Paper text:
Here, we describe the structural characterization of an apex-targeting antibody lineage and autologous clade A viral Env from a donor in the Protocol C cohort. We previously characterized the V2-apex PCT64 bnAb lineage from an elite neutralizer in the International AIDS Vaccine Initiative (IAVI) Protocol C (PC) cohort (Landais et al., 2016, Landais et al., 2017). In this study, we combined negative stain and cryoelectron microscopy (cryo-EM) single-particle approaches with X-ray crystallographic studies of early and late autologous Env-antibody complexes to decipher molecular details of the co-evolution of [name] Env and the immune system response over the course of several years of chronic infection. Comparison of Ab-Env complexes at early and late time points reveals that, within the antibody lineage, the CDRH3 loop rigidifies, the bnAb angle of approach steepens, and surface charges are mutated to accommodate glycan changes.
The early Fab was the closest relative to the least mutated common ancestor (LMCA) among the PCT64 monoclonal antibodies and neutralized early M4 virus at an IC50 of 0.0229 μg/mL. We solved crystal structures of both the early and late Fabs at 1.6 Å and 2.4 Å, respectively. The overall structure of the late Fab was similar to the early Fab, apart from CDRH3, which at the early time point adopts a β-hairpin at the base but is “splayed” at the tip, resulting in a very different paratope. Whereas crystal packing interactions may influence the CDRH3 conformation (MacLeod et al., 2016), we concluded that the splayed conformation of the PCT64-13C was the likely conformation of the unliganded antibody based on two observations: the early Fab contains a Gly100D “hinge” that could allow for splaying, and this conformation is observed in the cryo-EM complex of early SOSIP-early Fab. Consistent with computational predictions that sulfotyrosines are common in earlier antibodies from this lineage, we observe a sulfated tyrosine at position 100I of the early Fab CDRH3 (Landais et al., 2017). Due to the disordered residues at the tip of the CDRH3 of the early Fab, we were unable to confirm whether any of the other tyrosines in the region are sulfated. Electrospray ionization (ESI)-mass spectrometry (MS) analysis, however, indicates a heavy chain molecular weight ∼160 Da above the predicted mass, suggesting the presence of an additional sulfate in the Fab. To further investigate the potential N130 glycan binding pocket in the early Fab, electrostatic charge potentials were mapped onto the surfaces of the Fabs, revealing a shift from positive to negative charge near the apparent binding pocket for the glycan. In the early Fab, the positive charge is mainly contributed by Arg93 of CDRL3 (patch a). When the PC64 Fab structures were positioned in the cryo-EM maps, the splayed CDRH3 topology of the early antibody would create a larger interacting surface compared to the later time point antibody.
Author numbering:
A (entry chain H): 1 to 52, 52A, 52B, 52C, 53 to 82, 82A, 82B, 82C, ...
B (entry chain L): 1 to 27, 27A, 28 to 94, 96 to 213
Write the structure that this text describes.
Amino acid sequence: EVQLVESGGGLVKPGGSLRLSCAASGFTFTNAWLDWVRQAPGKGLEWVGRIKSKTDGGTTDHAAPVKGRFTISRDDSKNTVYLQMNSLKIEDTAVYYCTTGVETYDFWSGYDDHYYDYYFKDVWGKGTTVTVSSASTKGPSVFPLAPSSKSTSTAALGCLVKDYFPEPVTVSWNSGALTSGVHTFPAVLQSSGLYSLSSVVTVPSSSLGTQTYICNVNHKPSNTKVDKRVEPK
Amino acid sequence: EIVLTQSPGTLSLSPGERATLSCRASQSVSNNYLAWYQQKPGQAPRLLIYGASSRATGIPDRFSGSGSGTDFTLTISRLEPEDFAVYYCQQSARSFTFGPGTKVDIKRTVAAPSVFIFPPSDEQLKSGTASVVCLLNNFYPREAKVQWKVDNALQSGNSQESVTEQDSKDSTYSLSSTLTLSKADYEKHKVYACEVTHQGLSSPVTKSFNRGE
């Protein structure tokens, strides 16, 4: 089976460098091109560059925003394409994929090579994540968003998981026993370079004096684990 | 270099309906250079159509592509539940670029947001900062907006929001907005309000509190 696997991502300071690898299996690049495509958080797809097949001489082309900073190359002996990334910028933060097309020909028996059925399909890796940031590792504070029987619209409560770096944090409620009414929002990146995430639950207002709501927060990079019981004010 | 534009940004349809997605190219391109991709959350994109109208291997018959010149169309003859996703056109005629994407989401009846405001917690105030949170819950379609006022003055530049994916059962969205203040600024003012707009509201909604009451 044709497969691509990206590696070499990580967290890097502005101005820093990474080298990504795209290792092909089940085929070689003798007659196949290789594209790098990236996707910033919550954004669309952006082509980064291409290297042509070995038959076409392995010519490379790179997108204008990365020209001079990123360079595609290949080690033919490894069936691997590299993306050398220098002078990294915070807007280079993205998931980086490699991808190519796979052509196959089913030649007609009794005819010559001009007669065939043509098949075409793409292959993508799972991606590798590049994060470019000046921030240092910090665990979140977990602040309660307290409900009230006088603030109905049901009641709502939550936890604000504020000021952490890097991603991710996980949030559950009542150790996973509560998912009805739960919304855990995408993290936002604050102007400070720290992330913040909110998780909320809508609940009956008339049982706040007897039901327990605890948000379970885990930030593995800082070894932060915090359970916050959210009580009415 | 060629710019691909896509309309609409979000197409709202029911399972079983025909979907028609539009891609425009800033320069004319030959058909061999135009492709369409699908992408679902947490997954790489998947090629649907290449050469404007050819299906990639294993792509179902309900996907088809048409058009020429500067105007291309992806058609899904009858939407299946797995087809609610983002669709991108793509061209290789001059460099390699993608369109901005059209999201196809599940149509349901209009639902107004339920709105909740949360003052900064006493714990956060002790820690030295102040965040005010506004929750806009279970609305449809996606176009709810919120603005913040402090002592009746509209705020700008000091809020951030994010939005959930469409709910798998009730097909609604939720949105949370956070107003970030210094603790000194929070203690300097009294009335904190978020004003919410959405087509399902008979009138916009304000939720507010007075600090210290």
